[PDB]
PDB file of all heavy atoms in Angstrom:
ATOM      1  N   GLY P 356     -27.798  -4.398 -22.285  1.00 71.07           N
ATOM      2  CA  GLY P 356     -28.791  -3.365 -22.086  1.00 71.07           C
ATOM      3  C   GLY P 356     -29.253  -2.669 -23.350  1.00 71.07           C
ATOM      4  O   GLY P 356     -30.439  -2.592 -23.650  1.00 71.07           O
ATOM      5  N   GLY P 357     -28.280  -2.129 -24.117  1.00 67.77           N
ATOM      6  CA  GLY P 357     -28.563  -1.420 -25.321  1.00 67.77           C
ATOM      7  C   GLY P 357     -29.175  -2.322 -26.389  1.00 67.77           C
ATOM      8  O   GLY P 357     -29.866  -1.839 -27.267  1.00 67.77           O
ATOM      9  N   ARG P 358     -28.878  -3.611 -26.370  1.00 68.02           N
ATOM     10  CA  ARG P 358     -29.402  -4.540 -27.364  1.00 68.02           C
ATOM     11  C   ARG P 358     -30.848  -4.804 -27.113  1.00 68.02           C
ATOM     12  O   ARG P 358     -31.644  -4.816 -28.035  1.00 68.02           O
ATOM     13  CB  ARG P 358     -28.629  -5.898 -27.340  1.00 68.02           C
ATOM     14  CG  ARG P 358     -29.168  -6.889 -28.380  1.00 68.02           C
ATOM     15  CD  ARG P 358     -29.199  -8.356 -27.941  1.00 68.02           C
ATOM     16  NE  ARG P 358     -30.333  -8.712 -27.031  1.00 68.02           N
ATOM     17  CZ  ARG P 358     -31.595  -8.901 -27.404  1.00 68.02           C
ATOM     18  NH1 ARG P 358     -31.994  -8.807 -28.660  1.00 68.02           N
ATOM     19  NH2 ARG P 358     -32.471  -9.224 -26.467  1.00 68.02           N
ATOM     20  N   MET P 359     -31.158  -5.065 -25.852  1.00 67.94           N
ATOM     21  CA  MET P 359     -32.537  -5.259 -25.428  1.00 67.94           C
ATOM     22  C   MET P 359     -33.386  -4.040 -25.753  1.00 67.94           C
ATOM     23  O   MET P 359     -34.525  -4.221 -26.176  1.00 67.94           O
ATOM     24  CB  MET P 359     -32.596  -5.610 -23.930  1.00 67.94           C
ATOM     25  CG  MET P 359     -32.011  -6.989 -23.595  1.00 67.94           C
ATOM     26  SD  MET P 359     -31.686  -7.238 -21.816  1.00 67.94           S
ATOM     27  CE  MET P 359     -33.324  -7.408 -21.143  1.00 67.94           C
ATOM     28  N   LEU P 360     -32.857  -2.878 -25.538  1.00 67.76           N
ATOM     29  CA  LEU P 360     -33.560  -1.629 -25.877  1.00 67.76           C
ATOM     30  C   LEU P 360     -33.824  -1.557 -27.379  1.00 67.76           C
ATOM     31  O   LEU P 360     -34.905  -1.147 -27.817  1.00 67.76           O
ATOM     32  CB  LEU P 360     -32.807  -0.420 -25.362  1.00 67.76           C
ATOM     33  CG  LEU P 360     -33.444   0.974 -25.580  1.00 67.76           C
ATOM     34  CD1 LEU P 360     -34.883   0.977 -25.031  1.00 67.76           C
ATOM     35  CD2 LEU P 360     -32.627   2.093 -24.960  1.00 67.76           C
ATOM     36  N   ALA P 361     -32.838  -1.885 -28.159  1.00 68.27           N
ATOM     37  CA  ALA P 361     -32.944  -1.955 -29.627  1.00 68.27           C
ATOM     38  C   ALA P 361     -34.106  -2.825 -30.040  1.00 68.27           C
ATOM     39  O   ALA P 361     -35.000  -2.367 -30.778  1.00 68.27           O
ATOM     40  CB  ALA P 361     -31.658  -2.426 -30.224  1.00 68.27           C
ATOM     41  N   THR P 362     -34.166  -4.070 -29.567  1.00 68.98           N
ATOM     42  CA  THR P 362     -35.223  -5.001 -29.868  1.00 68.98           C
ATOM     43  C   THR P 362     -36.590  -4.567 -29.240  1.00 68.98           C
ATOM     44  O   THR P 362     -37.606  -4.828 -29.835  1.00 68.98           O
ATOM     45  CB  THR P 362     -34.869  -6.458 -29.495  1.00 68.98           C
ATOM     46  OG1 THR P 362     -33.784  -6.880 -30.325  1.00 68.98           O
ATOM     47  CG2 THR P 362     -36.057  -7.395 -29.708  1.00 68.98           C
ATOM     48  N   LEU P 363     -36.605  -3.963 -28.037  1.00 67.90           N
ATOM     49  CA  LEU P 363     -37.842  -3.603 -27.378  1.00 67.90           C
ATOM     50  C   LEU P 363     -38.508  -2.475 -28.174  1.00 67.90           C
ATOM     51  O   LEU P 363     -39.644  -2.556 -28.579  1.00 67.90           O
ATOM     52  CB  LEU P 363     -37.638  -3.178 -25.931  1.00 67.90           C
ATOM     53  CG  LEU P 363     -38.533  -3.589 -24.739  1.00 67.90           C
ATOM     54  CD1 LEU P 363     -38.762  -2.386 -23.865  1.00 67.90           C
ATOM     55  CD2 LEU P 363     -39.871  -4.181 -25.080  1.00 67.90           C
ATOM     56  N   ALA P 364     -37.757  -1.388 -28.405  1.00 65.41           N
ATOM     57  CA  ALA P 364     -38.310  -0.160 -28.995  1.00 65.41           C
ATOM     58  C   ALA P 364     -38.690  -0.333 -30.488  1.00 65.41           C
ATOM     59  O   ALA P 364     -39.525   0.404 -30.979  1.00 65.41           O
ATOM     60  CB  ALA P 364     -37.383   0.970 -28.801  1.00 65.41           C
ATOM     61  N   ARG P 365     -38.080  -1.301 -31.197  1.00 65.95           N
ATOM     62  CA  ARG P 365     -38.330  -1.554 -32.629  1.00 65.95           C
ATOM     63  C   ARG P 365     -39.464  -2.542 -32.936  1.00 65.95           C
ATOM     64  O   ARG P 365     -40.155  -2.409 -33.947  1.00 65.95           O
ATOM     65  CB  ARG P 365     -37.065  -1.980 -33.364  1.00 65.95           C
ATOM     66  CG  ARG P 365     -36.236  -0.821 -33.852  1.00 65.95           C
ATOM     67  CD  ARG P 365     -34.854  -1.259 -34.262  1.00 65.95           C
ATOM     68  NE  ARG P 365     -33.907  -0.151 -34.127  1.00 65.95           N
ATOM     69  CZ  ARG P 365     -33.596   0.681 -35.119  1.00 65.95           C
ATOM     70  NH1 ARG P 365     -34.132   0.571 -36.317  1.00 65.95           N
ATOM     71  NH2 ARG P 365     -32.748   1.644 -34.885  1.00 65.95           N
ATOM     72  N   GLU P 366     -39.615  -3.547 -32.062  1.00 63.60           N
ATOM     73  CA  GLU P 366     -40.716  -4.517 -32.176  1.00 63.60           C
ATOM     74  C   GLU P 366     -42.009  -3.874 -31.659  1.00 63.60           C
ATOM     75  O   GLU P 366     -43.076  -4.220 -32.156  1.00 63.60           O
ATOM     76  CB  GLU P 366     -40.371  -5.806 -31.417  1.00 63.60           C
ATOM     77  CG  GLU P 366     -41.382  -6.916 -31.590  1.00 63.60           C
ATOM     78  CD  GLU P 366     -41.259  -7.731 -32.890  1.00 63.60           C
ATOM     79  OE1 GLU P 366     -40.286  -7.496 -33.649  1.00 63.60           O
ATOM     80  OE2 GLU P 366     -42.130  -8.606 -33.112  1.00 63.60           O
ATOM     81  N   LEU P 367     -41.892  -2.958 -30.687  1.00 65.79           N
ATOM     82  CA  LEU P 367     -43.038  -2.230 -30.151  1.00 65.79           C
ATOM     83  C   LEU P 367     -43.563  -1.242 -31.149  1.00 65.79           C
ATOM     84  O   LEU P 367     -44.758  -0.899 -31.136  1.00 65.79           O
ATOM     85  CB  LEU P 367     -42.591  -1.482 -28.892  1.00 65.79           C
ATOM     86  CG  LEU P 367     -43.531  -1.406 -27.694  1.00 65.79           C
ATOM     87  CD1 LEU P 367     -43.927  -2.770 -27.163  1.00 65.79           C
ATOM     88  CD2 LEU P 367     -42.871  -0.569 -26.598  1.00 65.79           C
ATOM     89  N   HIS P 368     -42.737  -0.763 -32.034  1.00 66.45           N
ATOM     90  CA  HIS P 368     -43.127   0.149 -33.111  1.00 66.45           C
ATOM     91  C   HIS P 368     -43.687  -0.600 -34.254  1.00 66.45           C
ATOM     92  O   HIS P 368     -44.473  -0.100 -35.034  1.00 66.45           O
ATOM     93  CB  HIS P 368     -41.955   0.968 -33.604  1.00 66.45           C
ATOM     94  CG  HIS P 368     -42.309   2.377 -33.937  1.00 66.45           C
ATOM     95  ND1 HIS P 368     -42.779   3.335 -33.008  1.00 66.45           N
ATOM     96  CD2 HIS P 368     -42.318   3.046 -35.146  1.00 66.45           C
ATOM     97  CE1 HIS P 368     -43.011   4.464 -33.623  1.00 66.45           C
ATOM     98  NE2 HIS P 368     -42.758   4.315 -34.903  1.00 66.45           N
ATOM     99  N   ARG P 369     -43.290  -1.858 -34.444  1.00 67.89           N
ATOM    100  CA  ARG P 369     -43.770  -2.708 -35.504  1.00 67.89           C
ATOM    101  C   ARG P 369     -45.163  -3.298 -35.212  1.00 67.89           C
ATOM    102  O   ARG P 369     -46.069  -3.231 -36.037  1.00 67.89           O
ATOM    103  CB  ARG P 369     -42.714  -3.749 -35.920  1.00 67.89           C
ATOM    104  CG  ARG P 369     -43.169  -5.179 -36.001  1.00 67.89           C
ATOM    105  CD  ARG P 369     -41.998  -6.093 -36.267  1.00 67.89           C
ATOM    106  NE  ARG P 369     -41.999  -6.646 -37.632  1.00 67.89           N
ATOM    107  CZ  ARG P 369     -41.756  -6.020 -38.781  1.00 67.89           C
ATOM    108  NH1 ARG P 369     -41.518  -4.708 -38.793  1.00 67.89           N
ATOM    109  NH2 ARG P 369     -41.779  -6.686 -39.927  1.00 67.89           N
ATOM    110  N   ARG P 370     -45.349  -3.889 -34.036  1.00 70.12           N
ATOM    111  CA  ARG P 370     -46.646  -4.402 -33.579  1.00 70.12           C
ATOM    112  C   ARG P 370     -47.681  -3.303 -33.243  1.00 70.12           C
ATOM    113  O   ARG P 370     -48.847  -3.619 -32.961  1.00 70.12           O
ATOM    114  CB  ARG P 370     -46.442  -5.319 -32.365  1.00 70.12           C
ATOM    115  CG  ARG P 370     -45.432  -6.396 -32.525  1.00 70.12           C
ATOM    116  CD  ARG P 370     -45.443  -7.388 -31.379  1.00 70.12           C
ATOM    117  NE  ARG P 370     -44.656  -8.579 -31.783  1.00 70.12           N
ATOM    118  CZ  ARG P 370     -44.690  -9.761 -31.200  1.00 70.12           C
ATOM    119  NH1 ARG P 370     -45.450  -9.962 -30.141  1.00 70.12           N
ATOM    120  NH2 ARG P 370     -43.954 -10.755 -31.656  1.00 70.12           N
ATOM    121  N   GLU P 371     -47.233  -2.036 -33.234  1.00 70.84           N
ATOM    122  CA  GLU P 371     -48.062  -0.883 -32.867  1.00 70.84           C
ATOM    123  C   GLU P 371     -48.704  -0.997 -31.463  1.00 70.84           C
ATOM    124  O   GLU P 371     -49.752  -0.356 -31.191  1.00 70.84           O
ATOM    125  CB  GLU P 371     -49.106  -0.557 -33.954  1.00 70.84           C
ATOM    126  CG  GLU P 371     -48.528  -0.120 -35.265  1.00 70.84           C
ATOM    127  CD  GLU P 371     -49.558   0.122 -36.328  1.00 70.84           C
ATOM    128  OE1 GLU P 371     -50.618   0.693 -35.984  1.00 70.84           O
ATOM    129  OE2 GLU P 371     -49.332  -0.240 -37.494  1.00 70.84           O
ATOM    130  N   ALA P 372     -48.097  -1.785 -30.592  1.00 71.82           N
ATOM    131  CA  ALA P 372     -48.465  -1.908 -29.170  1.00 71.82           C
ATOM    132  C   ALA P 372     -47.945  -0.693 -28.317  1.00 71.82           C
ATOM    133  O   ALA P 372     -47.221   0.171 -28.827  1.00 71.82           O
ATOM    134  CB  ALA P 372     -47.998  -3.225 -28.620  1.00 71.82           C
ATOM    135  N   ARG P 373     -48.321  -0.688 -27.052  1.00 71.96           N
ATOM    136  CA  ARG P 373     -48.092   0.533 -26.289  1.00 71.96           C
ATOM    137  C   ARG P 373     -46.960   0.491 -25.267  1.00 71.96           C
ATOM    138  O   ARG P 373     -46.136   1.378 -25.244  1.00 71.96           O
ATOM    139  CB  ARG P 373     -49.423   0.935 -25.606  1.00 71.96           C
ATOM    140  CG  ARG P 373     -49.475   2.370 -25.159  1.00 71.96           C
ATOM    141  CD  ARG P 373     -50.629   2.554 -24.236  1.00 71.96           C
ATOM    142  NE  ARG P 373     -50.646   3.882 -23.600  1.00 71.96           N
ATOM    143  CZ  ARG P 373     -51.505   4.244 -22.641  1.00 71.96           C
ATOM    144  NH1 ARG P 373     -52.426   3.387 -22.190  1.00 71.96           N
ATOM    145  NH2 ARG P 373     -51.427   5.475 -22.140  1.00 71.96           N
ATOM    146  N   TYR P 374     -46.903  -0.557 -24.473  1.00 69.30           N
ATOM    147  CA  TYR P 374     -45.980  -0.619 -23.326  1.00 69.30           C
ATOM    148  C   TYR P 374     -44.920  -1.755 -23.448  1.00 69.30           C
ATOM    149  O   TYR P 374     -45.239  -2.819 -23.907  1.00 69.30           O
ATOM    150  CB  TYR P 374     -46.756  -0.766 -21.994  1.00 69.30           C
ATOM    151  CG  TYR P 374     -47.449   0.510 -21.517  1.00 69.30           C
ATOM    152  CD1 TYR P 374     -48.777   0.490 -21.127  1.00 69.30           C
ATOM    153  CD2 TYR P 374     -46.763   1.713 -21.452  1.00 69.30           C
ATOM    154  CE1 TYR P 374     -49.403   1.645 -20.646  1.00 69.30           C
ATOM    155  CE2 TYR P 374     -47.393   2.879 -21.018  1.00 69.30           C
ATOM    156  CZ  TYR P 374     -48.719   2.840 -20.613  1.00 69.30           C
ATOM    157  OH  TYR P 374     -49.328   3.990 -20.162  1.00 69.30           O
ATOM    158  N   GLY P 375     -43.728  -1.454 -22.982  1.00 70.03           N
ATOM    159  CA  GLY P 375     -42.637  -2.402 -22.950  1.00 70.03           C
ATOM    160  C   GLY P 375     -41.916  -2.397 -21.630  1.00 70.03           C
ATOM    161  O   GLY P 375     -41.887  -1.378 -20.901  1.00 70.03           O
ATOM    162  N   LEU P 376     -41.341  -3.525 -21.269  1.00 70.76           N
ATOM    163  CA  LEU P 376     -40.551  -3.702 -20.066  1.00 70.76           C
ATOM    164  C   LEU P 376     -39.189  -4.320 -20.444  1.00 70.76           C
ATOM    165  O   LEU P 376     -39.103  -5.303 -21.135  1.00 70.76           O
ATOM    166  CB  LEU P 376     -41.252  -4.547 -19.023  1.00 70.76           C
ATOM    167  CG  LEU P 376     -40.463  -5.094 -17.849  1.00 70.76           C
ATOM    168  CD1 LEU P 376     -40.342  -4.045 -16.743  1.00 70.76           C
ATOM    169  CD2 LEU P 376     -40.983  -6.415 -17.284  1.00 70.76           C
ATOM    170  N   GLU P 377     -38.128  -3.631 -19.955  1.00 69.78           N
ATOM    171  CA  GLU P 377     -36.794  -4.193 -20.058  1.00 69.78           C
ATOM    172  C   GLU P 377     -36.279  -4.437 -18.632  1.00 69.78           C
ATOM    173  O   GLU P 377     -36.316  -3.531 -17.781  1.00 69.78           O
ATOM    174  CB  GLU P 377     -35.882  -3.262 -20.865  1.00 69.78           C
ATOM    175  CG  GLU P 377     -34.584  -3.862 -21.330  1.00 69.78           C
ATOM    176  CD  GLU P 377     -33.539  -2.832 -21.784  1.00 69.78           C
ATOM    177  OE1 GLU P 377     -33.818  -1.910 -22.625  1.00 69.78           O
ATOM    178  OE2 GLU P 377     -32.415  -2.917 -21.289  1.00 69.78           O
ATOM    179  N   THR P 378     -35.833  -5.647 -18.377  1.00 71.65           N
ATOM    180  CA  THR P 378     -35.341  -5.970 -17.057  1.00 71.65           C
ATOM    181  C   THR P 378     -34.260  -7.039 -17.121  1.00 71.65           C
ATOM    182  O   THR P 378     -34.257  -7.809 -18.068  1.00 71.65           O
ATOM    183  CB  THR P 378     -36.457  -6.311 -16.057  1.00 71.65           C
ATOM    184  OG1 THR P 378     -35.911  -6.499 -14.714  1.00 71.65           O
ATOM    185  CG2 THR P 378     -37.264  -7.496 -16.496  1.00 71.65           C
ATOM    186  N   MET P 379     -33.339  -7.050 -16.190  1.00 70.76           N
ATOM    187  CA  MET P 379     -32.326  -8.092 -16.122  1.00 70.76           C
ATOM    188  C   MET P 379     -31.804  -8.239 -14.728  1.00 70.76           C
ATOM    189  O   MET P 379     -31.853  -7.284 -13.970  1.00 70.76           O
ATOM    190  CB  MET P 379     -31.177  -7.784 -17.135  1.00 70.76           C
ATOM    191  CG  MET P 379     -30.371  -6.484 -16.894  1.00 70.76           C
ATOM    192  SD  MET P 379     -31.117  -4.832 -17.166  1.00 70.76           S
ATOM    193  CE  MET P 379     -31.384  -4.887 -18.911  1.00 70.76           C
ATOM    194  N   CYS P 380     -31.328  -9.459 -14.431  1.00 70.72           N
ATOM    195  CA  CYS P 380     -30.508  -9.739 -13.255  1.00 70.72           C
ATOM    196  C   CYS P 380     -29.088  -9.124 -13.406  1.00 70.72           C
ATOM    197  O   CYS P 380     -28.699  -8.769 -14.502  1.00 70.72           O
ATOM    198  CB  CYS P 380     -30.491 -11.240 -12.928  1.00 70.72           C
ATOM    199  SG  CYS P 380     -29.694 -12.328 -14.143  1.00 70.72           S
TER     200      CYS P 380
END
Side-chain angles (χ1 to χ4, degrees):
Chain P
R358 179 218 77 79
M359 292 165 71
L360 182 53
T362 296
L363 224 223
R365 273 166 206 268
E366 187 80 5
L367 221 58
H368 216 67
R369 130 184 250 72
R370 307 189 166 196
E371 296 178 40
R373 200 193 171 186
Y374 286 132
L376 166 83
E377 195 197 308
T378 185
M379 62 291 295
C380 64

